Structure 1
Amino acid sequence: HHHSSGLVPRGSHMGTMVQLNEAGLFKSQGLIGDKWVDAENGHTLPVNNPATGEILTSVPFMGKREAEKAIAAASQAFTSWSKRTANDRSKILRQWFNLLIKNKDDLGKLIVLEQGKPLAEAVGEIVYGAAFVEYYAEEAKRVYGDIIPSPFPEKRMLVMKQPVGVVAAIAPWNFPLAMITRKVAPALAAGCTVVIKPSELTPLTALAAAELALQAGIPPGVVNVVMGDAKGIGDAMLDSTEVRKITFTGSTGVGKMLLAGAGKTVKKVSLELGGNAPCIVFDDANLDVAVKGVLAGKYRNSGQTCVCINKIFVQDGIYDKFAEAFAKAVSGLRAGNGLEPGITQGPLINETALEKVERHVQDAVSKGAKVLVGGKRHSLGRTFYEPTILGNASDEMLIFREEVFGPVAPLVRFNTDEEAIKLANNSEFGLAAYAFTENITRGWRVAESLEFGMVGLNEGLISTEVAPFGGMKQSGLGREGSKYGLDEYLEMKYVCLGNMAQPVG
């Protein structure tokens, strides 16, 4: 126990890790049924702080066998959980919501430690992610069935909606809490059980969330958390006949593979895949609203969101004023450790993410783009990249065609409204899109014309639990958030009663 003893590795932010551990929120095991568990062979994978390079802890490196045990625990728990009243599940889910909010400051710090975003953004993610738990606790009691007028006098027709069964959920690293709750909350609300595989890059927040679910009275087996061999876990989820639904948020390539694999057992599948959000700034945009909106929509989480602005189309008349004011706004951003106050840009998740950003910037500059701000690795090193604006961008550039997932904003000049809309709609992406215009007719027209699941009109921050989020075309299937998000975890049942009598008098 002497301070020189090396059992707990000494390092930066040890005070924060001790406080998280004293709160019961610092886990180094997965959760299967009523036990916190190691992998069967004791293998582990490290979780590192992307801002310092230091070890936080190791988590199990699980695979097929552990995922099968998690699925069996969820299947066993489903019978009782699904037969509880909606009111009973709602009270328990509200207890989980209250615990997430009560522990938001510590949970926010855990997101900073493993993912790197600024603390204000991490605490905001706890409020946002917990909002799905509250929303679906309320919505659990509003799974309404129907009575349909029957065209046959002797028959009566009903529609019931019942939980689908065991859900397999796979989440990415960019929102380590909100991506878990967006999937787990509606599934539990409907009466499903879940086996969730968080990103191996950011698993600690999912484990803290599951510890708080247990404290809330969520029975063992209703929530299970496994990680490690993502391929092996995914195959166990796809091969299981008890897994009736899969939900995935992540890369397009992995999502397409999961969709293809789900076909052999006819699972219900909902996915949110890569986006490439266009943003159209028209001549009649309110300049301050457009600058503030694009700053927020582009550089939130250092550009590492599914809905982030990927390319900005600026109309010829406002181009110079927008480029100047947008550059001034971006120059105010500051990169660093998310646990330092005043920091507004965190590091990119890993070296692969940084290499992609550099590839996009190099390609654009080679094809004629002008670096108006940034355009290089930050002086801090590691995976910090300077917030960048690339003027005179074009449809031949890699950043125009593909998702950069980094703090780079390319500007494309355009002449007519019809030109910008047709260009925005000319891709296989269909997640978020944005438009800035003060005119009622133009605003409504652009919002209707855009072939995207979500449109911000004079708004750069559109994320909410109350509205349906998801993609069109190759950006996804199904929706998350809103009353419709719950339908993904239910099966409709038509009941036809026959030999019915006519009413009397």
Structure 2
Amino acid sequence: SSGLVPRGSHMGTMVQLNEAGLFKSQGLIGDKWVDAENGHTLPVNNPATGEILTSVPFMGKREAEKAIAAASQAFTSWSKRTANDRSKILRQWFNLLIKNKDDLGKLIVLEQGKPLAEAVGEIVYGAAFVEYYAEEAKRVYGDIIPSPFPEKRMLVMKQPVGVVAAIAPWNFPLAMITRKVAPALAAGCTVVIKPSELTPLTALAAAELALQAGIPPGVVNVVMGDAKGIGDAMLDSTEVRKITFTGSTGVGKMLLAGAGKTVKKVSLELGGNAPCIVFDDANLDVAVKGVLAGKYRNSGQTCVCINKIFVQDGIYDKFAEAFAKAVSGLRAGNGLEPGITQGPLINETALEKVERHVQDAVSKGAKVLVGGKRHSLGRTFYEPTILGNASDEMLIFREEVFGPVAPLVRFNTDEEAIKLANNSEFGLAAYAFTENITRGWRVAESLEFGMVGLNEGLISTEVAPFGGMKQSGLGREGSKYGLDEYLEMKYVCLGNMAQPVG
């Protein structure tokens, strides 16, 4: 035969991305797109097909040092622009992300696997942080504080902290980049970001659009490869004043310890193990829809995912039946195909963890209501699963599954469920469903979690502060408060001041 023999299954999509200038195979340091110093690379694979999409550089310490130096050089000028000037440029970036949302969504699907509707939704959500902080840049207010000394006047100024090092995970290849880069740039900081080596392409496309928006070279730098070597260069640098990380708890704890030697500002978001309480007086349809959305978005691979569901005795049977019917409607497959609502797990390690959790639960008495095996598609597709008769001795109760498995734990009293929900070292998201005003407010107040969905399974938004309590993190992303993570307060005391006349 004669004809095109593609190496991959989605060449038309990759060609369209490349024609749009959104398909990159190099990192970004200052005013250049670059390879690693020795030309080494790593493959980026499509999780639904196994195919290599492209190689990207395998960078380390030296490239990270060069990126930090570029960011440090760019900081002086960027930080001294007016807020209005930074705001205009950031809005241009926001507009370009939205203009390119359909192609950027497809790029997320290719490298990370989620359904196209979720990927395009991630562009809209991620871009919203850029818009939000473009507006908030102009609202970094200082204070004039009444002085108890007649001869003194007291001010508070808020100024950018300096060069920021940012590390982002694979589960939201765009939004985890903008949630960190947007506030940093708005405040007047510059950044060195290390996206996940599993999903770097979307970060590179976002950086290309930042350059097109007029973000000066060196304000945004993107490096990837040897995550440990890059992270150590970020921690060892004097010029890096702040480090922001989202990812695994074990890695985050090491980063936080390492940041202590230079007293860096740190914000981080780590593992969660979100409880969801369905009370007897929940609106059943609202609860089923909210739990389905909160558990199975991104095939369970979200930091705010519902991990365990406590269901009150009176509603248990009706909830379990309606929830199983809802879960049975999910469809796994390649995210570029219409009607697909579950993508593959990111890799074999993730699949093996899901299988370990399910095997442990079934060995301790859990009942498989739906699913409980690898999907017929193979690879890293796992059937959406519900485990009935779950308990506090199970691995899935104690640890974050990060997959499409919903364990149900029966409970009797409200106090019992709230105390169980609060009995862990996690503190990211939690959820509750009840129609009663007193009960709803009480549960929301009582839960020891940074976010609470009350009659809501989809809580993500750029306007509100997201982050963890206890061992789930430090600091917040989104809202006015997210910008404070990138600022230093300064108290200025003016002396030898005079009394007003007449």
> Whole-Å Cα distance in 2 between the matches of residues 20 and 434 of structure 1?
38
Identity, in percent, stands at 100
Cα distance change on mapping 1:500 and 1:365 into 2, 3 Å: same
> Whole-Å Cα distance in 2 between the matches of residues 178 and 211 of structure 1?
16
- 2:65 pairs with 63, 68, 78, which one? 68
Q: Provide, for residues 439-496 of structure 1, a one-character-per-residue CA deviation record: whole Å limited to 9, x for no partner.
A: 0000000000000000000000000000000000000000000000000000000000
- Structure 1 residue 8: deviation in Å? 9.3
Q: Are 1:504 and 2:501 an aligned pair?
A: yes
- Structure 1 residue 218: deviation in Å? 0.1
Size of the aligned set, in residue pairs, is 502
> Whole-Å Cα distance in 2 between the matches of residues 13 and 341 of structure 1?
15
Give the secondary structure class of the aligned counterpart of 1:313.
strand
Q: Are the aligned partners of 2:8 and 2:53 in contact in 1 as well (CA < 8 Å)?
A: no
Give the secondary structure class of the aligned counterpart of 1:274.
coil
> Whole-Å Cα distance in 2 between the matches of residues 58 and 10 of structure 1?
13
- 1:492 pairs with 489, 492, 497, which one? 489
TM-score after normalising by structure 2: 0.99
Unaligned 5+ runs, structure 2:
none
> Whole-Å Cα distance in 2 between the matches of residues 103 and 442 of structure 1?
44
Q: Are 1:405 and 2:402 an aligned pair?
A: yes
> Whole-Å Cα distance in 2 between the matches of residues 5 and 154 of structure 1?
89
> Whole-Å Cα distance in 1 between the matches of residues 104 and 457 of structure 2?
26
Give the secondary structure class of the aligned counterpart of 2:479.
coil
Q: Are the aligned partners of 2:288 and 2:323 in contact in 1 as well (CA < 8 Å)?
A: yes
- Structure 1 residue 209: deviation in Å? 0.1
> Whole-Å Cα distance in 2 between the matches of residues 98 and 411 of structure 1?
43
- Structure 1 residue 11: deviation in Å? 2.1
Give the secondary structure class of the aligned counterpart of 1:483.
helix
> Whole-Å Cα distance in 1 between the matches of residues 3 and 213 of structure 2?
35
Q: Are the aligned partners of 2:357 and 2:395 in contact in 1 as well (CA < 8 Å)?
A: yes
Q: Are the aligned partners of 2:97 and 2:127 in contact in 1 as well (CA < 8 Å)?
A: yes
> Whole-Å Cα distance in 2 between the matches of residues 308 and 425 of structure 1?
16
Q: Are the aligned partners of 2:301 and 2:402 in contact in 1 as well (CA < 8 Å)?
A: yes
> Whole-Å Cα distance in 1 between the matches of residues 388 and 272 of structure 2?
21
> Whole-Å Cα distance in 2 between the matches of residues 463 and 445 of structure 1?
22
Cα distance change on mapping 1:256 and 1:177 into 2, 3 Å: same
> Whole-Å Cα distance in 1 between the matches of residues 477 and 6 of structure 2?
40
> Whole-Å Cα distance in 1 between the matches of residues 116 and 320 of structure 2?
29
> Whole-Å Cα distance in 1 between the matches of residues 255 and 2 of structure 2?
46
Q: Provide, for residues 27-57 of structure 1, a one-character-per-residue CA deviation record: whole Å limited to 9, x for no partner.
A: 0000000000000000000000000011100
Q: Provide, for residues 421-454 of structure 1, a one-character-per-residue CA deviation record: whole Å limited to 9, x for no partner.
A: 0000000000000000000000000000000000
| Partner residue, 2:329 | 332
Give the secondary structure class of the aligned counterpart of 1:89.
helix
- Structure 1 residue 10: deviation in Å? 2.7
Give the secondary structure class of the aligned counterpart of 1:246.
strand
- Structure 1 residue 263: deviation in Å? 0.1
- Structure 1 residue 128: deviation in Å? 0.1
> Whole-Å Cα distance in 1 between the matches of residues 204 and 400 of structure 2?
29
> Whole-Å Cα distance in 2 between the matches of residues 28 and 86 of structure 1?
33
- Structure 1 residue 227: deviation in Å? 0.1
- Structure 1 residue 6: deviation in Å? 11
> Whole-Å Cα distance in 1 between the matches of residues 450 and 337 of structure 2?
36
Cα distance change on mapping 1:63 and 1:69 into 2, 3 Å: same
- 1:142 pairs with 139, 143, 161, which one? 139
Cα distance change on mapping 1:92 and 1:5 into 2, 3 Å: farther
Cα distance change on mapping 1:392 and 1:27 into 2, 3 Å: same
Q: Provide, for residues 237-284 of structure 1, a one-character-per-residue CA deviation record: whole Å limited to 9, x for no partner.
A: 000000000000000000000000000000000000000000000000
Residues 280-295 of structure 1: matches in 2 within 5 Å?
A: 280-295=277-292
> Whole-Å Cα distance in 2 between the matches of residues 8 and 133 of structure 1?
40
